[PDB]
Amino acid sequence: MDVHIDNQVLSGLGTPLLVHLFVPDTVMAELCPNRVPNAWCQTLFSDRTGLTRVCRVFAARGMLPGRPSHRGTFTSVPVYCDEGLPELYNPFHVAALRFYDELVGELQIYYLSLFEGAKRALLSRVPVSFSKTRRAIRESRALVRGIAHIFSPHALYVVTYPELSAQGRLHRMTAVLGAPEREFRFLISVALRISASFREKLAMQAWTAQQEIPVVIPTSYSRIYKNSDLIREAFFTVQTRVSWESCWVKATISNAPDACLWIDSHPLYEEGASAWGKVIDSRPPGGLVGAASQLVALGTDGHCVHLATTSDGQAFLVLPGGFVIKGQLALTPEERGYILARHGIR
Amino acid sequence: ASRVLSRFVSQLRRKLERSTHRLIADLERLKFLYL
């Protein structure tokens, strides 16, 4: 019970109201394995998409709940969204958290899943920290309740207890769709324009491999891959269900930090959620020969289709078999600014 | 003389119930707008 009194006194600048949370250790195992993170608040809207200011959230792991029903970490969700009077709530409304120790993993959370659980729960001098004074006397079991989490079908534990007028005005709040809809269809729009760029690049060229990366290939490659077997290039667009782990937007945010590359890897036909957004280096003295070795090891991955994005406005597709199809990247800077504001600061 | 006002606060409870049952009435209409 430390991070709640940490962030409660901290975020008084950009947030009127602060909600406190638990996060179980099973619910973020598919987010980041091996306990690699240890945050940043940016709650986007449902139909009032735009852009909003960011707020920092502090947290801790490895410290156990008073409930022995599950044993996990500490988080907390700021709420600052409602204009003027905070009595209205935005329904069907995402609130993004960027839990991190060094920006890996995201945390999408709802206002219904938060507040329905919240209602379900309920010669001079030094001045004292005022808000910590009421948490020590509570120490009770009814303050924490189990909430069916909507993004991942699991339990997310909230903590709240009858503090004061900020949390007292919270439990009376109600009000009279499209917050998970917009980001996915926006990903499919940029994926369709990139696949259209690949279509027109294969059309204006002879529909032929230039083979930018060198591999040796067997003579039965037109047999063990069938004729025109682009069924993986076909269902590429459904397979990109993630984007901000995907390397495609990673090059656009990398414009603020010249010879850099990011690589997505998707398997040959559904071997699993392989990886998204790995790094090809040119800065350290491993050098361009090490970049070439990693690149040809990328190209010899005979069961994974790779997509290459550059920083300068160019896209590339790597067929397994060393074949490369060139492509453009040129997107409207409104979506660019929307992406870099969705992650961080312009 | 000793049974005059308790009937009236009974009707006041019926009035608060017939008022606050509207909060039950409009939520499934909100569901019909939503889902």
Binding site: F92, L112, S113, E116, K119, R120, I147, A148, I150, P153, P180, E181 | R13, L16, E17, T20, H21, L23, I24, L27, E28, K31, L35
Partner: peptide, 30 residues
């Protein structure tokens, strides 16, 4: 979205169950 709205109606229904048990306070002295 269908399974998401399934989870959403599931968490929305407990709101009206809590509001029913909140309305039941007036029953308890009547």
């Amino acid at each position: 979205a269908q399974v998401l709205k399934n989870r959403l109606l599931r968490v929305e229904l407990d709101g009206i169950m809590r509001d029913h048990l909140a309305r039941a306070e007036e029953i308890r002295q009547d």
